[PDB]
Amino acid sequence: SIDLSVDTSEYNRPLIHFTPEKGWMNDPNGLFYDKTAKLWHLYFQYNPNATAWGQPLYWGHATSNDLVHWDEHEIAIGPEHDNEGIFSGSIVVDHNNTSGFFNSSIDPNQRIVAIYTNNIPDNQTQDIAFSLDGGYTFTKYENNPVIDVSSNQFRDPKVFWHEDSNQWIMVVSKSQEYKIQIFGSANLKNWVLNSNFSSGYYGNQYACPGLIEVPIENSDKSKWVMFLAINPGSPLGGSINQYFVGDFDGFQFVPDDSQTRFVDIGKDFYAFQTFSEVEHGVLGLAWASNWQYADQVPTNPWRSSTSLARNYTLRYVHTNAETKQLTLIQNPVLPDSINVVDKLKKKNVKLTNKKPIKTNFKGSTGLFDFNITFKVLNLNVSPGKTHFDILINSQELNSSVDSIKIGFDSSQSSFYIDRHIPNVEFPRKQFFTDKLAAYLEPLDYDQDLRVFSLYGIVDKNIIELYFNDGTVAMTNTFFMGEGKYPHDIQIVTDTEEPLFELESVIIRELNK
Amino acid sequence: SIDLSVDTSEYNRPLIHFTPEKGWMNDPNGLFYDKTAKLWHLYFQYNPNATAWGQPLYWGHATSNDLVHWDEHEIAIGPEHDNEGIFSGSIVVDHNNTSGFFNSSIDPNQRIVAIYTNNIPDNQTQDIAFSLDGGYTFTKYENNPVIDVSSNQFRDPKVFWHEDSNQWIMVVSKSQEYKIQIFGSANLKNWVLNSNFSSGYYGNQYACPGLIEVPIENSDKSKWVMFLAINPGSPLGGSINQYFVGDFDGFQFVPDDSQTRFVDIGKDFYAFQTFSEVEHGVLGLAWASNWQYADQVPTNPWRSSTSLARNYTLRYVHTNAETKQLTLIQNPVLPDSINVVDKLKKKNVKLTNKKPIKTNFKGSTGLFDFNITFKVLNLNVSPGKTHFDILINSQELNSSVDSIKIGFDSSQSSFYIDRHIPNVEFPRKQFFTDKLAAYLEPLDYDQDLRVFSLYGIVDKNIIELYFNDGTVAMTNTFFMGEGKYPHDIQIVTDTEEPLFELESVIIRELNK
């Protein structure tokens, strides 16, 4: 329950990634859109008292109108005793007052209900609560709990309105049984078990499930996508998110196939949840850290940001050369309401060790982005050189420039990050992986030449990569030395002839 | 046509992990046991002409009687033209001469047939060949190929005798279709397609499938285990091996569940195949490297070792605290026929920063092993110290000691490796991951205290870890600076009080 005189925001706090002002944030909760206030809501696992996870545990709260300018508000929910906690959960908007909390004086689009896990010593139940003031203060049902199965491991329900079966659906995790459980109710108070679902990578625990209809691109058609988070025992170490693509009738999810696929192959993307009430598309964000080392990272007086919100679709994409697969695609949310401080733009440039691309901006905000489409040429080079790299350098402090690398190796058809930074030591950095990669097929062939694309956005302590137009995404935090934060960006290579042609490049400085 | 005057065997060549004398080895092939010659056979993807994969491509050959003393022989098989290559494949012993290559003058346990992929420009077929001299020289069938489906991506068949359906089974990969294909035949020459199987992690390509009956421990019973290799696009990067546990009838494999589980969560364990004719148990080995950087590692004039052979069983193990899962267990093969040069043995020792455990041996062979059971005590310590570490140090050369770390963090319940070594730079080391971890549940509770176990064996350039009696295995290569190789081994910690009790410890110097 510490805190104090040390503040790293100067070089550590992201600008456009939500962050609690002080304390501890994990799982994002109760994500919804308020159509009449035209307002986006975000709640979160919050321990105000400590720089680490502890009880009592609360739902934090903050709103946005644009999904990058967050305003923090007073806590939406707390537990009865210091002994307990309001765990993960969701929100729904009860338009037709099936729940009966709702007067005639309350806008249908403001009839908010939260379903959350109530965690007691030796007990975990599914409880609900309602807000009369547009989501800012809540009243416990009164006959809570609404679901109790005598379990110590039963938590994190996402709830939604299924037209087709005419009910409220609940995906909640029977955590250590590796079941996602599917309840139905016409009521939000009375619940009937419909089915259990076990699949994908098991890890140590199922958690924060999610089920939602995601639109196939360029088409009337859609599919039903089951999200699932697992910690610990991610094959990458710690925590991760995964999905399955199939069909829901309101009683059981049937995956089209039985493959395992991950939502984000970065290290720091856990407890993804989608927004309720989104008119057009599927939108979500996650908790942008890994349970292996989240509580030891060198930020103070808060810890943890969220990811950007992302737009989710399904696209037929090439996973090898012969076969395409229906595949979850995600792209970041950036409204024009974001200042461009300065930018470097370039067209049809050949990359060689004598033509680097050096950002030369006046000063820095630590919020950059980069948008690149490239062609891989026919030119044979020695194996050490079949790569180009983006270096994201800090300003020189103790006469030393902290940098992180993002490259692509044509011989490997795979992008890569190296987030190693020397002299920055914190507890559990044995699990803080420095090198990760993603294999991708060409976005396109221009003749015989291969074409790849990548958008990345750096934010003081977090970096998001989207490969080939959002075919794979890779979230990862990074910790530079005290006082240092991104200043400039380079795109370099060791080859003397051009191996890569950059069709388009746009490096941007950004702001609030 | 490179090779020359540079030889690293002095500090790089493993002693008990098979290695070709010179050239390039990947997938191990045709693994079988010769009951009459009481002799173990290993074949492999071999390019004798280069330090990298190239055609013409051959099956190499070597035998052993103890599975750690390897004798290299003349090539067992080659292609017709420099244009082509004998790809991966297996061997069976045709006892009852169903194939008809076999006289009365040939021992039933020497009636060898190889089934291998014949790779032609634009064609890949399933071909077969027999040996009359106990596996040393082969004759192509004559009406080869025996399976052709007009495919450019159709390779790597494992074959076996199914009593219960009275036929020869073939698991072969339709590589870019993500199908494992199951053919049956009474003949080995005529083949009928029985089923297709698609599951687990897809990656870019299915490869080197395997199906076999593995015995459940302490029981009459067994299960049918489907192995699969995938490269590229292992979630860890590059290449990896995975499995599924279910039931075979001779026509289709049905997995009990639909989960994804990996055979070795290390970075260098691909193209696992099991031995034919083993009387008692399932035994196998893999190619001990990753396709991301195998051809760039600093070993000359060979590249690549195999793993040790391992004994494979299924055990009920706790994956969280509530649930156990039927789980592939693997432990290493080490006959007593292995010299113990020297050893340090210890009992019930409390670990603290002042009581380290330093190996003090006369000199070094670079072949060490270590066998450790431990208890995690009730003692609260600052977060940076909840770990202990095994340091595997080289001798000091340019006044610098190359080391690789293997630890366990009690707060994480997870083991870890850090194979970083400074100043050693080679092509594609961007993909050469340095930090990897494995989360495990206790092996046993002694009272309330937790008990974990780990055997690891180092061999000049490779390290194999088996956690909690073979519940998870982690294979990884390592490349120390020119001339440097393991010399001594420490077990240290930073804590002042004992956090770990080492029930038993046995560090060993080993030899041929």
Ligand SMILES: OC[C@H]1O[C@@](CO)(OC[C@@]2(OC[C@@]3(OC[C@@]4(O[C@H]5O[C@H](CO)[C@@H](O)[C@H](O)[C@H]5O)O[C@H](CO)[C@@H](O)[C@@H]4O)O[C@H](CO)[C@@H](O)[C@@H]3O)O[C@H](CO)[C@@H](O)[C@@H]2O)[C@@H](O)[C@@H]1O
């Ligand atoms: O907020 C509840 C909510 O989150 C979800 C989704 O993640 O699950 C949380 C869950 O696991 C958290 C976990 O790690 C916590 C961690 O440290 C905290 O806990 C310790 C005591 O348990 C404290 O000593 C420490 O100071 C706290 O900060 O545990 C490690 C310490 O060994 C640290 O590395 C982590 O930061 O808790 C267990 C216990 O360690 C871990 O295995 C998890 O990774 O939280 C409860 C129990 O904490 C567990 O049931 C959940 O998995 C979601 O399911 C809930 O809705």
Ligand SMILES: OC[C@H]1O[C@@](CO)(OC[C@@]2(OC[C@@]3(OC[C@@]4(O[C@H]5O[C@H](CO)[C@@H](O)[C@H](O)[C@H]5O)O[C@H](CO)[C@@H](O)[C@@H]4O)O[C@H](CO)[C@@H](O)[C@@H]3O)O[C@H](CO)[C@@H](O)[C@@H]2O)[C@@H](O)[C@@H]1O
């Ligand atoms: O020998 C066939 C046998 O092995 C298996 C099981 O692994 O399949 C191997 C397979 O993929 C090989 C792959 O890596 C090779 C690699 O370099 C070699 O190949 C290139 C020729 O295409 C050369 O450029 C290079 O110099 C050779 O050393 O490819 C990369 C070069 O970019 C290097 O990183 C590797 O060392 O080849 C493709 C293309 O890169 C990779 O994606 C693979 O990892 O072999 C063929 C093609 O080589 C492919 O069909 C196989 O999947 C087994 O299935 C076979 O029975």
Ligand SMILES: *[C@@H]1O[C@H](CO)[C@@H](O)[C@H](O)[C@H]1NC(C)=O
């Ligand atoms: C689902 O699991 C619950 C909890 O184990 C159990 O009571 C119920 O039998 C299951 N129902 C179905 C349909 O599988």
Ligand SMILES: *[C@@H]1O[C@H](CO)[C@@H](O)[C@H](O)[C@H]1NC(C)=O
């Ligand atoms: C990046 O470039 C493409 C090409 O114009 C553009 O459509 C896209 O919106 C840009 N920004 C992002 C975040 O993808």
Ligand SMILES: *[C@@H]1O[C@H](CO)[C@@H](O)[C@H](O)[C@H]1NC(C)=O
């Ligand atoms: C398996 O897939 C192949 C590829 O077309 C097809 O010919 C075959 O009919 C399928 N067989 C079965 C039994 O499903």
